[PDB]
Amino acid sequence: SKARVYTDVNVVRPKEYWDYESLVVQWGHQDDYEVVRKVGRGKYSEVFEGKNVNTNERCVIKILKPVKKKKIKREIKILQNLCGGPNIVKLYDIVRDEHSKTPSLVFEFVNSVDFKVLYPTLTDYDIRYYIYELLKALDFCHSQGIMHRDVKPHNVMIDHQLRKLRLIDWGLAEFYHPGKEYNVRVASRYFKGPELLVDLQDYDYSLDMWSLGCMFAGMIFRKEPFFYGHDNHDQLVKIAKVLGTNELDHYLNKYQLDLDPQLEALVGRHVPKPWSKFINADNQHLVSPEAIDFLDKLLQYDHQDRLTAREAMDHPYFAQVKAAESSRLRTQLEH
């Protein structure tokens, strides 16, 4: 399998762009920063609000847990390559402790909450707006040869007053090289695409579009997580109970994959459950025929069949939000 969009970005670009294992990290000065307040704990890092001790400027300090140097260099290189792109978090500095050599990443202060915190106070219009903003981040990173590989509500930070979205936590992101077999142990279970669950290792940017579809289904149907499996096998079972097993058979045959016998027995046989069966009185204000059609075009087993980020932005569901962006950009271009 190879990506059908942005296929050769890292073939055309030289090794200095994507060869993160060779990066010579330009460390800043740890003494410039001080932790102020803990913000969150995660599997690979702890996040704090911090300050520059020289200027009192606020920042976010992400203290990385012990991991291989290659993974740290990867995140740094990706953040450096994407810095300044639309709706991508901005890396400001990289420092490490004098004695332990533990690295920290220093980011702009984001002044935001994650997408889930916002769910209860968002309307249909706000969902269309913020999903479009997330699509802009994904189209940009994909266009720069990078897959995020961990799209989920906690990695989408929103400053709701400024109507500003940022895609954060690039620690699982990778460069896309056509032909490369990647580790399938990425993303978070409920957002893993079927490629990760059937051991299709030569996946691409389209993984992020599955993850986005899972987020979108959870939002519009008020069912979080939408696919709630109890392990990686059961995650495929939950998907198959909705998409059905006929299309799973087609996918496996197309990519010359054989389900593990245990997984085959767990998945069994299932007819599809139409999207309309998830509508109820409590979520109907967020659902429309356009929303269902958009979702259906994201949640396809075959990664090549899914909408790309740019194709998603052109879907009728976003027609008004796209038009508003186009008009704004026009006036700024005339200015």
Ligand code: NA
């Ligand atoms: Na994760």
Ligand code: NA
């Ligand atoms: Na297909």
